Amino acid sequence: KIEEGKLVIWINGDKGYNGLAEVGKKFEKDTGIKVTVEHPDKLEEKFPQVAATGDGPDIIFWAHDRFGGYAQSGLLAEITPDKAFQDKLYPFTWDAVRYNGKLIAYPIAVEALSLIYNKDLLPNPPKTWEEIPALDKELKAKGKSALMFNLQEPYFTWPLIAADGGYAFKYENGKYDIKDVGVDNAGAKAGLTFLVDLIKNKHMNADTDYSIAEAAFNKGETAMTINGPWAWSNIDTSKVNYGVTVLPTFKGQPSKPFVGVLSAGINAASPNKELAKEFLENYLLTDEGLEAVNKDKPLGAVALKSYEEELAKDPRIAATMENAQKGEIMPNIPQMSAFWYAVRTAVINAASGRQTVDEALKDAQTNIVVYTDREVHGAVGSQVTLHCSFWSSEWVSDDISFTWRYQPEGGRDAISIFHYAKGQPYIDEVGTFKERIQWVGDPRWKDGSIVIHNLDYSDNGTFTCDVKNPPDIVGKTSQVTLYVFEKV
Numbered sequence: 472k473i474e475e476g477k478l479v480i481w482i483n484g485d486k487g488y489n490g491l492a493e494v495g496k497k498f499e500k501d502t503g504i505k506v507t508v509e510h511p512d513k514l515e516e517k518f519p520q521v522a523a524t525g526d527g528p529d530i531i532f533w534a535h536d537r538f539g540g541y542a543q544s545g546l547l548a549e550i551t552p553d554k555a556f557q558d559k560l561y562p563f564t565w566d567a568v569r570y571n572g573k574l575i576a577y578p579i580a581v582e583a584l585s586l587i588y589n590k591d592l593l594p595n596p597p598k599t600w601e602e603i604p605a606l607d608k609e610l611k612a613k614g615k616s617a618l619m620f621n622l623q624e625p626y627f628t629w630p631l632i633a634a635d636g637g638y639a640f641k642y643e644n645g646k647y648d649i650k651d652v653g654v655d656n657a658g659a660k661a662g663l664t665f666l667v668d669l670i671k672n673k674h675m676n677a678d679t680d681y682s683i684a685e686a687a688f689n690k691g692e693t694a695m696t697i698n699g700p701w702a703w704s705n706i707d708t709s710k711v712n713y714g715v716t717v718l719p720t721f722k723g724q725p726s727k728p729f730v731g732v733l734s735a736g737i738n739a740a741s742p743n744k745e746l747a748k749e750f751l752e753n754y755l756l757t758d759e760g761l762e763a764v765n766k767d768k769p770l771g772a773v774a775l776k777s778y779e780e781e782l783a784k785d786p787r788i789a790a791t792m793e794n795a796q797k798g799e800i801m802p803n804i805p806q807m808s809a810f811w812y813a814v815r816t817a818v819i820n821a822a823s824g825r826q827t828v829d830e831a832l833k834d835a836q837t838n839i840v841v842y843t844d845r846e847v848h849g850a851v852g853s854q855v856t857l858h859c860s861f862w863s864s865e866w867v868s869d870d871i872s873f874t875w876r877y878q879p880e881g882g883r884d885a886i887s888i889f890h891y892a893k894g895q896p897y898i899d900e901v902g903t904f905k906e907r908i909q910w911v912g913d914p915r916w917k918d919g920s921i922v923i924h925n926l927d928y929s930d931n932g933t934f935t936c937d938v939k940n941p942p943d944i945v946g947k948t949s950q951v952t953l954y955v956f957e958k959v
């Protein structure tokens with residue numbers, strides 16, 4: 472439950488919260504109203520959790536993308552500044568916080584990821600992703616690495632994934648098609664494939680997270696990192712001589728970071744809505760208010776026209792804006808939340824080798840355990856496909872095995888005719904099917920199918936497919952019966 476004569480604010484711990492607290496101190500001096508600034512972990516998830524019982528902060532700071540979901544659920548107060556105030560901020564920043572015709576937050580700043588590079592290691596940073604492996608080998612021989620960035624959050628890997636064609640939700644005449652997701656298409660696969668072979672080639676580590684990449688760059692251990700304007704303060708402190716530049720191209724195309732508008736929403740259960748509007752409108756969104764936050768941790772390109780114009784000469788801000796121009800604004804639709812957890816899981820699963828990129832992105836796109844046909848009929852001379860597939864909770868072992876057995880009709884015993892094991896198909900030269908079996912399976916899609924060519928009358932019998940995918944060293948089986956005809 473929310474008290475009542477004061478303001479509690481949540482903001483991410485990577486942003487200028489001490490600078491925000493100082494604006495809080497000034498508000499408190501003028502008004503006598505206490506302003507507490509907190510930075511809870513995963514506050515983007517904590518907010519809806521507690522705001523559903525009417526709990527949480529009076530005001531929450533996050534990128535605009537999460538606010539559609541908050542608004543849909545009725546967690547945010549409608550924002551109603553007059554036209555005079557609105558005119559103080561860029562119109563596009565207001566569009567980012569409009570949901571279902573209503574303004575539901577105040578925009579603060581435009582963030583995009585950039586390439587950051589150590590000028591003493593790399594006076595001339597690569598223009599291209601494809602250069603990076605060769606660069607890394609050079610730098611490795613000198614006890615350094617080429618690149619480290621946060622691999623745990625899809626925000627950071629998305630620019631590469633989207634570069635050659637990936638998208639979240641298709642944008643089509645004024646609206647997002649929630650049914651048309653582009654995390655599976657050929658472009659997205661190429662981008663994530665490039666990323667996982669950086670890892671498989673030891674140019675990056677699948678475990679690398681935000682703290683590890685920041686520490687490595689700031690200690691001069693790696694030549695480049697990918698991060699937003701909040702990060703620049705920490706590198707200034709370290710003294711590393713850095714530049715901030717355009718992200719490398721991939722297959723000749725710009726990297727495409729998702730652009731965020733840092734925004735401040737007012738809790739619908741806040742008894743302090745007029746005080747919150749006063750703070751944000753009269754204290755935060757002023758040159759001095761934004762300056763105080765910005766000098767703590769850089770904001771990016773601020774929403775407030777006067778101060779954006781003041782800051783716009785900074786070439787690090789120019790680079791941020793150039794990267795944003797090449798990327799695209801995040802949708803603010805409530806589905807964004809599902810999108811992010813889907814791609815997060817796909818990246819981690821692909822980066823660790825639990826899935827191939829195809830498998831991984833299929834699942835993201837979407838977010839009797841053995842199957843054979845019952846009975847197949849063939850003509851003499853024809854070929855028949857003997858489908859076999861399975862479903863499992865396990866990743867695909869490789870060590871995965873498939874075995875086909877055959878039992879002639881009226882016959883006694885089932886004999887092996889085909890075996891897939893340790894990555895290779897073996898036929899059997901014993902076979903009455905020798906030179907007539909064809910492997911058409913693919914263990915990566917949990918498929919063990921074969922084709923029998925040039926059917927004969929005496930091929931009549933029952934085939935059994937047996938699959939082991941080790942965890943899972945217990946054989947699951949299914950049977951298919953073949954009848955061969957002159958015709959029918």
Ligand SMILES: OC[C@H]1O[C@H](O[C@H]2[C@H](O)[C@@H](O)[C@@H](O)O[C@@H]2CO)[C@H](O)[C@@H](O)[C@@H]1O
Binds near residue numbers: 485534537582626627
């Ligand atoms: O990684 C998925 C995550 O990415 C975007 O979050 C950013 C946020 O915009 C930045 O301000 C910065 O703090 O880093 C975050 C990524 O770690 C989305 O805003 C967020 O909803 C999403 O879950």
